[PDB]
Amino acid sequence: TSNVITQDLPIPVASRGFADIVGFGLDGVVIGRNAVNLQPFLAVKNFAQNAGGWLTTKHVRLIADTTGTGKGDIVGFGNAGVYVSVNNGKNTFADPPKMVIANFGYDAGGWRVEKHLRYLADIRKTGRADIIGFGEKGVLVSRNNGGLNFGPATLVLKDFGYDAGGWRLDRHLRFLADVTGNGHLDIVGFGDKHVFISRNNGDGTFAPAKSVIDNFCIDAGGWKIGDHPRFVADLTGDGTADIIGCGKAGCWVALNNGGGVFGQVKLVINDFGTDKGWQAAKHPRFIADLTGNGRGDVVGFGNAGVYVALNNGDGTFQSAKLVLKDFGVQQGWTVSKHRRFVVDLTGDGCADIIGFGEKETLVSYNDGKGNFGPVKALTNDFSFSGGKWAPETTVCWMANLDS
Amino acid sequence: TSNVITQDLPIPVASRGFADIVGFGLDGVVIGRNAVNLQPFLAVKNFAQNAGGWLTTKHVRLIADTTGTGKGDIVGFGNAGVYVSVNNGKNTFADPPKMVIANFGYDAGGWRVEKHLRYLADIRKTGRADIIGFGEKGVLVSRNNGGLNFGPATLVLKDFGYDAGGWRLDRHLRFLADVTGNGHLDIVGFGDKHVFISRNNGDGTFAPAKSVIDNFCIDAGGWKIGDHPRFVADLTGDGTADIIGCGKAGCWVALNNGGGVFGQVKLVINDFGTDKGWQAAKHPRFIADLTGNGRGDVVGFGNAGVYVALNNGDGTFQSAKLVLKDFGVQQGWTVSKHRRFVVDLTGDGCADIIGFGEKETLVSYNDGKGNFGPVKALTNDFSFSGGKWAPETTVCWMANLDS
Ligand SMILES: CC(=O)N[C@@H]1[C@@H](O)[C@H](O)[C@@H](CO)O[C@H]1O
Ligand SMILES: CC(=O)N[C@@H]1[C@@H](O)[C@H](O)[C@@H](CO)O[C@H]1O
Ligand SMILES: CC(=O)N[C@@H]1[C@@H](O)[C@H](O)[C@@H](CO)O[C@H]1O
Ligand SMILES: CC(=O)N[C@@H]1[C@@H](O)[C@H](O)[C@@H](CO)O[C@H]1O
Ligand SMILES: CC(=O)N[C@@H]1[C@@H](O)[C@H](O)[C@@H](CO)O[C@H]1O
Ligand SMILES: CC(=O)N[C@@H]1[C@@H](O)[C@H](O)[C@@H](CO)O[C@H]1O
Ligand SMILES: CC(=O)N[C@@H]1[C@@H](O)[C@H](O)[C@@H](CO)O[C@H]1O
Ligand SMILES: CC(=O)N[C@@H]1[C@@H](O)[C@H](O)[C@@H](CO)O[C@H]1O
Ligand SMILES: CC(=O)N[C@@H]1[C@@H](O)[C@H](O)[C@@H](CO)O[C@H]1O
Ligand SMILES: CC(=O)N[C@@H]1[C@@H](O)[C@H](O)[C@@H](CO)O[C@H]1O
Ligand SMILES: CC(=O)N[C@@H]1[C@@H](O)[C@H](O)[C@@H](CO)O[C@H]1O
């Protein structure tokens, strides 16, 4: 398994553990701790549409451990900078939050959701998350120096920027993933003609980009942003991140075989591709371990419901099959109104299914083998409801509040 | 609130948090992680009646953080010494476990459940647990030197031991509690004629015993082990442990000044004592914060049900009253078959009620003011299920696996 950060899933969730619900709703942050008696509570009256003036169009809202206690904190990139509400480890979050650095904000540094990416990750393997942003002139890192002291925002690499050179959210992808196995997140960029790796130097800097694959890109295979989603994930169990994507004809995989260098692209699954009806606008696909393997499996929310193809263990896959007649288009699920995730909720290393639906937060549990049990309702909260939880003005994530 | 270690409750549980179930069953350690879909899993095939030859009459089985990751490990004092299964932070524990010191065991130092006490505590406040034993010649300490290296068992104090001067499990009480207010756990011992305290110096050693109270003892006020239970708990909210006991006429307390000097011994509740029918054999009593204000409240499982008396905040109390018609003698609950605990299950700092009954593990939830809702079944698991979970051959504890 690898700890991986993408654009669509910027909060890493443990392959084996009990994912918690974090909702940035209209009136504040609402926590649904994974627990025997689920009870959402308004934890912080901030970070919200109607409390603090937070907008999905201008701001980024996340969870990460900023103090090192192993407890996840609320983190938001607002106007004047980054704001942190600390988790005190006794189920209470600081309110009001503290502004921890005057950078990475809409007014401080001119960060834009339409041009730039902002991530939180422990890239120095020190137990706290640093701030890393793919900004204008390239990658800017701010080191987390303990007790909410964030060092200067610093240009550590003159690449992968909107203006260094030409990186666009409508053409390219930029992820963090350990492609070498040293436990440090490296940079993976899908550019125009090459997947590039920028290795992690261990000290908050990354080395210059090196081309590793001549596929999976807008001008190298014809891979378009929405239509052909791409992923980084350990598909072999060697602890290093491989590459997999859903094309036209199905799922192509490039296996990592040199601690950061890649084998040739192969079609491993005859499905999940546009050729079989899969559409950016309708059918989210994911990579998750559904078998406790340490290897990633393919999960797709299709028309009739949930499809899955299981990794044998070596990056080859069993045929796709329907495992659950729910959470698909048939049952009213839409990308505009609802959220779906594939995360372990039961600590068995076998990812489960959670959907924030029309009126209910629904779930189906992995039987521990990649099959799923009946759809159960967790709570009325976090659902679209009118929508009190519209994606336009709210944000829901799964996250392990205990690391 | 003050973290405390007692003979009945050697494992500290968070007053605000989500306590997990840990059962040392017939076939191994069964983990019951506090989560939305409680799914007990056989975590380690050891530490058990029929896996490792672990017997309730010879051995001690606990949960403590022995590595400093904040994740509770499985620790057991067996025949040849102390064995640990490390918790890796992803809900898996090493199996088999490994021996970390050939001492403090039935055949390694002649340790006896009938004569000695063995505890795991972070007495040096270094983030991981030392081994503390009250043995033959006094208090033996083994320093957790990291990475499962443990220093030689060293006699740190010639007192509180079976042969120094004559401490007896049928006459006396030995607890760990921070009474002095310096954040370190002190030895609190109820001897013949006095309650003694031994100040934790901070370095792995303990100052000589000092008499602080002429009461609460077998030869000071007529306090008997079975019939008149005693506790240490923060009753005033200053983070400093006070003393409270269920006597004949009710509950008596002596309050801590904040630095280990104790005030008068006074009667604060007219109930919970032998005079009102409370018996060692039938009616377990606890101190837990049922209102989330950081001061301990009294809870007793009597004949008709659960009785409670609420702390005003300063060691004075409201009247006792019955809050729930269950978990009592009349409903079949017996010490010989069943387990009852009062712990926060929901993260609101208000202790809830959980009982391992004849056929089910049942729960009643605190409403946040010390009242309790309808009784719900959490699972068939961990219940007596005759006699899959008999107390003669199995051990159930509550604990916070994630700290
Ligand atoms: C979107 C944004 O930045 N909102 C912040 C709010 O969270 C914060 O509490 C306040 C500081 O007083 O400033 C507001 O502008
Ligand atoms: C979007 C972006 O890159 N903003 C950066 C800002 O964080 C930095 O402080 C400043 C000076 O180096 O340069 C800006 O371009
Ligand atoms: C959008 C894109 O792919 N840009 C890449 C750039 O990141 C990299 O530095 C360079 C290596 O020559 O190749 C460029 O064209
Ligand atoms: C978009 C979608 O749901 N595609 C599925 C395809 O993956 C599957 O192979 C087939 C089952 O026969 O049915 C199609 O509808
Ligand atoms: C869009 C949505 O939420 N669809 C759900 C469906 O998944 C579920 O099977 C059903 C019964 O709970 O309720 C529907 O509303
Ligand atoms: C009660 C006891 O000590 N049992 C231990 C067991 O935990 C261990 O796995 C085994 C192998 O060394 O040795 C046994 O004696
Ligand atoms: C029960 C007990 O105290 N046993 C101890 C043993 O742990 C220690 O190793 C030895 C030498 O100090 O002395 C014994 O009395
Ligand atoms: C059982 C008991 O109380 N023993 C105590 C001993 O621990 C203490 O060191 C001494 C102080 O004078 O008094 C003894 O009687
Ligand atoms: C076991 C018990 O209740 N003993 C108490 C004693 O603590 C108290 O000092 C005394 C006052 O007269 O009354 C006794 O009954
Ligand atoms: C052991 C027991 O249940 N004793 C209770 C006592 O605490 C209570 O004050 C009284 C009146 O409700 O009823 C007694 O039987
Ligand atoms: C000892 C025991 O488990 N007693 C329970 C009782 O508390 C519960 O109210 C009832 C209904 O579930 O079932 C009894 O057997």
Author numbering:
A (entry chain B), B (entry chain A): 2 to 404
Kindly provide excerpts from the paper associated with this entry.
In this paper, we report the crystal structures of a lectin from Agrocybe aegerita, designated as AAL2, in its apo- and complex forms with GlcNAc and GlcNAcβ1-3Galβ1-4GlcNAc, as part of our endeavors to develop a system to facilitate the identification and purification of O-GlcNAcylated proteins. AAL2 was recently discovered from the fruit body of the edible mushroom A. aegerita. AAL2 was found to specifically bind nonreducing terminal N-acetylglucosamine (GlcNAc) moieties of either alpha- or beta-linkage and was reported to have the activity of inducing apoptosis in hepatoma cells in vitro as well as inhibiting hepatoma growth in tumour-bearing mice in vivo. The overall structure of AAL2 monomer is a single domain with the shape of cylindrical torus with a diameter of about 51Å and a height of about 27Å, showing a very regular, seven-bladed β-propeller fold formed by the blades packing in a circular array.
